[PDB]
Amino acid sequence: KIADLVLLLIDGNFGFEMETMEFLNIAQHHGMPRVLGVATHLDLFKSQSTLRASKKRLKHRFWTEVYQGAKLFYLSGVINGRYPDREILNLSRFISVMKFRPLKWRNEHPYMLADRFTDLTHPELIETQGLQIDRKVAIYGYLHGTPLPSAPGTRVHIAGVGDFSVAQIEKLPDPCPTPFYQQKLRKRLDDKDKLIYAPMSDVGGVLMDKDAVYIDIEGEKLMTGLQSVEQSIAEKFDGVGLQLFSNGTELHEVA
Amino acid sequence: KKAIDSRIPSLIRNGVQTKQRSIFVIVGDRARNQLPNLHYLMMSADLKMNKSVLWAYKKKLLGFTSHRKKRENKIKKEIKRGTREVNEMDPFESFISNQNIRYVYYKESEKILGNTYGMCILQDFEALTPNLLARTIETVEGGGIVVILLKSMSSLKQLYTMTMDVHARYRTEDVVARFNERFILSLGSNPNCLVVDDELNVLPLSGAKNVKPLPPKPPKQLELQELKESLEDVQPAGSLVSLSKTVNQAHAILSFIDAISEKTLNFTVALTAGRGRGKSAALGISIAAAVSHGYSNIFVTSPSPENLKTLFEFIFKGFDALGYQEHIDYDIIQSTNPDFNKAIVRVDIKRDHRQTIQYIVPQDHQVLGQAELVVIDEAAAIPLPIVKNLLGPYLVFMASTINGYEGTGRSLSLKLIQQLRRQLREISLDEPIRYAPGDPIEKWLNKLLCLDVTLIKNPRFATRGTPHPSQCNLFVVNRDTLFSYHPVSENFLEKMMALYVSSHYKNSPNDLQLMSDAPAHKLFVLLPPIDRIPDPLCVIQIALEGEISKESVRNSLSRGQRAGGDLIPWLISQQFQDEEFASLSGARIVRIATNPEYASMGYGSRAIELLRDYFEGKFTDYSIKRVTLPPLLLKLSEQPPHYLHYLGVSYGLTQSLHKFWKNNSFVPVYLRQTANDLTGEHTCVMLNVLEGRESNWLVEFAKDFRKRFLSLLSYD
RNA sequence: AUGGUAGGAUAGUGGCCUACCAUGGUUUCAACGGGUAACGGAGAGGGAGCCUGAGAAACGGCUACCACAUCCAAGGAAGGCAGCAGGCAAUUACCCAAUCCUAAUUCAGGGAGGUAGUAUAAAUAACGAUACAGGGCCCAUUCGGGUCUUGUAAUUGGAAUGAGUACAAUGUAAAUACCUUAACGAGGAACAAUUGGAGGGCAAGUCUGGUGCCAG
RNA sequence: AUACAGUGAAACUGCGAAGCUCAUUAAAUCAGUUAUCGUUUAUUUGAUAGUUACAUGGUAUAACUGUGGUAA
């Protein structure tokens, strides 16, 4: 009900499955979006003749569900967890040039996909009442469809949850500023401008879940020595006294 | 997937929530690879933070270059050679790839003063200087992160020795680098400082050992939003006050508007604040208010027009708030002089009636007869006689910086206020615009650099009365102890710093390096009679200068960098070309500071007299352990004096100082022809010969200087 | 412009150009000019200029000018992409073997070149045996007339082989494809081609109008 | 291999670098043929120069060693 574009993975060796066409019927029944078929596991074929025949049967059947002449991609195998570059490059141009038809359902209501999830309930309330207590939650993301009214109290549904009312609404600057927008604040896209923003996913090497963050990665003796230090430097200062004069008493703390 | 120590995510999240900055110290060869992660953690905490990154380095970049096509040209080369995959690009490269990083040298720290950066990364620990610290840390925003990269092995060894025992200080094979050792110990005292390794393990020596995550969410903003809402209908006040970021400067802008409304030409408005508190925004907004009010001839004066760029920018923002449009309502005129770098000089405004804003050199006060308003920015840098001439029968706005750039001593501002006591209106801005008030790092930066130190009147002196000149005896100060960061030594250290700053005209942050690390400098304190931390009454900073420094110089040239210079021997050489004087061992009194309140009773003279006897021999190992602390002060008899031939002074020629040195048996040898631009005074070098040493050469120099002086009365 | 004398330049002839001299040259036997199914010569961002070499006013390089536009610490640097290929979307992968060539050359290379990638003939079936029943078909507006081995919506038997499943060799620069060729491969032969048309008939079913049991 | 002698990065020498897109033009394009005693011509091929020396100089530097500037 929300996917503007869909990439449909079909096991070429095995063929179509229930979970595929059911989405097509659900997509057919809630507003057909742009539908792109990608065929995989084709390297499993041992003969070229059966591969071509299998490709022909699959592409024609994909033309029954989706408009005849629909674009269907074919992927052979996976190397280093990566598909062949060119077929992966070929689909780049298609997705870039796709224009999307106006859908009645999507163009009349506001919707937005949760980029990240955060619970704002005070930890003290979680303890004095217990975990059972209802939780204050903040959900972030980009708005789609018709504009969302600025005044709070708007009624909104969350799939698999129930109906809630918007307690508070505020706009934040863009986490993933598009190139024409970022530089604003026939020419190819500059590779600096290309950006990736994924809060929940691990981008680079850092993954964040709940409030704990996870990352992947003579001097060595000294570092273990520093790490094993117990007393704080401020505490060590307390013990230190200084002689103001050569024969004067050690003065510890100024009154 | 390792779980990072929970202390680091809590500190970054806390500081963002309270709008406080944070310091991180990363130790390790792979230290650079953690900056991407630490930089990513920023936006996750809060997205609104500034994404621009400041990074300072001395000469070379850690493992890369700051030009793009070379990186792309190289990355193409590894891919084609096959060493790297076609699309492989590490996180450290990714951090540099997409973020806006400003590459800056340590020497050119002046350029970064105005701009605002979310994060500052400091490459080199050894080359750190107070100006490079005060300047860079001030450019970080509230919730920002400061990082210092202690990658050097010698720094790594230095950290080990202090942590194992604070008493022992690691020392390599003449620079002692005590301040850098202070920087380490002080970093521990900061509550919002975490020192970490390349594996993101929080080393325990940090002060931020118990930083706990604060609960989810200021009164300052409430007092500001209400004020803006109340004044929205009242133009031009509403639009101009809307630009205010803070409560105090909004009051200052309102106070300026009141002065503009009063129309009294004998009125004086003095704006005093620290650097980064938004004086220029207040002054620029106030100027825009005068244009809308109806003032025609508006003047602006400063030591150079280049410093006024930030002011004129904020005037135009005020003009935008007031509905003025460029090329229709006003025109901007830029300088044709190459020295001013196309700095804006004049703004002509045509709405209602012809109004003009124009820059003037401070010396050109004769044009001010027609001035309705002059705005004097950075009056601390202008000579006192000149600013007196600038105080004409017209409205005057003054912005003077306390502890900004070179600025001036606090007492000099106080002397200016006493003179004004012409109606005087005083405005003070205390609360910063860039971060939360009372940020630990500013509190921390102040104690390390002692910028915010203030002189205090001592009640016990009043009860006992002022000590007679004869009673006190001079004490030598041990630098290692004074520079150990003990609370007693720090509080003792502050007291000299107060006397250091208050007395004389100009004081740069880098001076605290010069007293600390350089060996030739020795500190003398004129303490009261011993009968509590002793309170200094006069402080003399002297530099050994002559043949004795030559051994140090030769070592410096062996290193490949000449360190410092011998001022007086060089001047006397270029002037008289006397080979003997260079060979002669002598001492230069770099500075002699006395309490302004107790001036004229003779503290300065006796300390010189006691100093003169000490080096004359009339009064006839304290080094810290090198990988329990020795006494803080050493008596004159306890330390042998070095053999000296003369005592020298260098100071701006003034009648009060010249009389003071004339009474102390000092003889003039030279006077600079060109006036120091900031003071307008002529530098003079005066010498005094000690008993038991030849005095013929001074007499010959004195004869020449008079004949030089006599003919040069006319020229300059 | 036609020509002579002399000179300048070319690799050289020559108004090709230069100084003087004569007023000439083509043409109603079609000069000159116009149209055309005369695809039946030019440049590499735009003009000007230079440089190399046997051969280029060079799809090479250099100078100034006119515009485009990139990076930057704003002090400078550099580009010819002002391109190419597409739509109103995969032009890729393998080679110098085969025909040829450039070179300090047998051997190096050539996106010259080559290799591969993405309307025409067949099959869906053929041959028997048995059992059980008397109706099957043709003509005719009309009434009726004409003719004889038939129907199965019944049971059953042994043979044949193609698409597929595929071991090989051959083929080739190698490889795909082609040709040839072991084993397996059918009764719902479910190993389950369609498209269009003409008629039916059925309910404790529904509706509408009537001269009941009717009609639509 | 007691001058080096196999192979050989780099550098100095030698040789060769000579499809597309727009416009359009009547024997001024092009085709056939003549002449160059009016010319240039790498290369191929055949001929062709009797008119300190038991071997001269850096009047020479690259590659190379090392010191640096620059955002580049």
SS (H, E, C) A39-55: EECHHHCCCHHHHHHHH
Q: To which residue do tokens 């106080």 refer?
A: B414
Run of H or E residues at B593:
strand B586-594
Q: Which of A216, A232, A242 sits opposite B489 (nearest CB)?
A: A242
- The answer for residues whose C-beta is within 8 angstroms of residue B713's C-beta and 6 or more apart is none
Task: Compute how many other C-beta atoms are within 10 angstroms of the C-beta atom of residue A77.
Answer: 12
Q: List the single residue in A with minimal CA-CA distance to B43.
A: A175
Rounded CA–C1' distance between B70 and C107, in angstroms: 39
Q: Is B306 left (phi over 0), alpha (psi -120 to 50) or beta?
A: alpha
Q: Give helix B440-449 / helix B130-138 axis angle, nearest 10°.
A: 160
Does nucleic acid strand D have an atom less than 7 angstroms from the CB of B662? no
Q: HEC profile for B330-346?
A: EEEEECCCHHHCCCEEE
Round to whole Å and give the CA distance between A129 and A117.
23
Rounded CA–C1' distance between A69 and C37, in angstroms: 39
Round to whole Å and give the CA distance between B451 and B170.
27
Task: Give the tokens for residue B304.
Answer: 């150079």
Residue B130: asked if its preceding bond is cis (omega within 30°), the reply is: no
Pair B496, B592: CB distance under 8 Å: no
Task: Give the tokens for residue B34.
Answer: 């953690």
Round to whole Å and give the CA distance between B222 and B48.
20
* Phi and psi at residue A157, to the nearest 5°: -110, 140
Q: Give helix B247-262 / helix B219-230 axis angle, nearest 10°.
A: 30
Query: B46: burial class by Cβ within 10 Å (0-12, 13-18, 19+)?
Result: middle
- The answer for residues whose C-beta is within 8 angstroms of residue B402's C-beta and 6 or more apart is B272, B273, B274, B410, B413
Q: Which of B68, B157, B629 sits opposite A242 (nearest CB)?
A: B629
Round to whole Å and give the CA distance between B172 and B626.
8
Q: To which residue do tokens 């004159």 refer?
A: B636
Residues of B in contact with A123 (CB under 8 A): 215
Residues paired with residue A156 on neighbouring β-strands, in sequence order: A164
Q: Which of B205, B207, B213 sits opposite A226 (nearest CB)?
A: B205
Task: Give the tokens for residue B84.
Answer: 């790297």
Residues of A in contact with B27 (CB under 8 A): 223
Query: B116: burial class by Cβ within 10 Å (0-12, 13-18, 19+)?
Result: middle
Tell whether B279 is in a known binding site: yes
Count interface pairs A-B at CB distance under 8 A: 152
Closest CA to B361 of B331, B340, B338: B340
Does nucleic acid strand C have an atom less than 7 angstroms from the CB of A49? yes
Round to whole Å and give the CA distance between B300 and B315.
12
Residues of A in contact with B190 (CB under 8 A): none
What sign for the dihedral angle of Cα B135, B136, B139, B140? negative
Q: To which residue do tokens 């003398």 refer?
A: B524
Closest CA to A74 of A33, A34, A41: A41
Round to whole Å and give the CA distance between A235 and A229.
12
Residue A151 CA: distances (Å) to CA of A56, A154, A166, B222, B490 = 55, 7, 9, 22, 56
* Beta strand residue intervals within B422-506, DSSP E: 423-429, 475-477
What sign for the dihedral angle of Cα B444, B448, B451, B453? positive
Q: To which residue do tokens 């150079």 refer?
A: B304
Cross-chain Cβ contact B9/A211 below 8 Å: yes
* Phi and psi at residue B198, to the nearest 5°: -70, -10
Tell whether B277 is in a known binding site: yes
* Phi and psi at residue B124, to the nearest 5°: -115, 125
- Helix count and strand count (H, E) for chain A: 7, 11
Stated length of chain A: 255
> Residue B69, CA: closest nucleotide via C1'?
C71
Round to whole Å and give the CA distance between B172 and B175.
9
Pair B555, B564: CB distance under 8 Å: no
Closest CA to B454 of B524, B493, B407, B501: B501
Q: HEC profile for B202-241?
A: ECCCCCCCCCCCCCCCCHHHHHHHHHHHHCCCCCCHHHHH
Query: B245: burial class by Cβ within 10 Å (0-12, 13-18, 19+)?
Result: middle
DSSP 3-state of A124: helix
Residue B1 CA: distances (Å) to CA of A205, B37, B195 = 9, 13, 22
Pair B58, B123: CB distance under 8 Å: yes
Does nucleic acid strand C have an atom less than 7 angstroms from the CB of A214? no
Are β-strands B117-122 and B53-57 bridged in parallel, bridged antiparallel, or unpaired?
Answer: parallel
Task: Give the tokens for residue B323.
Answer: 């509905």
Closest CA to B201 of B443, B444, B31: B31
Tell whether B209 is in a known binding site: no
Round to whole Å and give the CA distance between B413 and B380.
8
Residue A63 CA: distances (Å) to CA of A18, A39, B82, B349, B584 = 17, 14, 42, 70, 102
Task: Give the tokens for residue B435.
Answer: 């971060």
Round to whole Å and give the CA distance between A6 and B5.
40
Task: Give the tokens for residue B357.
Answer: 């804003």
Instruction: Identify residue B257 by its one-letter amino acid code.
Output: I
- The answer for residues whose C-beta is within 8 angstroms of residue A255's C-beta and 6 or more apart is none
Residue A59 CA: distances (Å) to CA of A11, A55, B39 = 12, 6, 47
> How far away is chain B from the Cα of A6, in angstroms, using its nearest Cα?
25
Instruction: Identify residue B596 by its one-letter amino acid code.
Output: P
Find how far residue B510's CA is from the centre of its chain. Answer: 7
Task: Give the tokens for residue A67.
Answer: 């408009």
Q: By what method was this entry solved?
A: cryo-EM
Would you call B46 an interface residue with chain A, using a CB distance cutoff of 8 Å?
Answer: no
Find how far residue B78's CA is from the centre of its chain. Answer: 46
Round to whole Å and give the CA distance between B294 and B287.
11
- Helix count and strand count (H, E) for chain B: 25, 23
Task: Compute how many other C-beta atoms are within 10 angstroms of the C-beta atom of residue A105.
Answer: 12
Which 111-170 residues of chain A approach strand C with CB closer than 7 Å?
A: none
Round to whole Å and give the CA distance between A253 and A238.
8
Query: B606: burial class by Cβ within 10 Å (0-12, 13-18, 19+)?
Result: buried
- Count of alpha carbons within 13 Å of B535, Cβ hemisphere only? 15
Residue B205 CA: distances (Å) to CA of B13, B174, B633, B638 = 21, 29, 29, 37
Cross-chain Cβ contact A233/B189 below 8 Å: yes
Does nucleic acid strand C have an atom less than 7 angstroms from the CB of A221? no
> Residue B68, CA: closest nucleotide via C1'?
C71
- The answer for residues whose C-beta is within 8 angstroms of residue A201's C-beta and 6 or more apart is A207
Pair B176, B158: CB distance under 8 Å: no
Round to whole Å and give the CA distance between B327 and B319.
12
Pair A108, A146: CB distance under 8 Å: yes
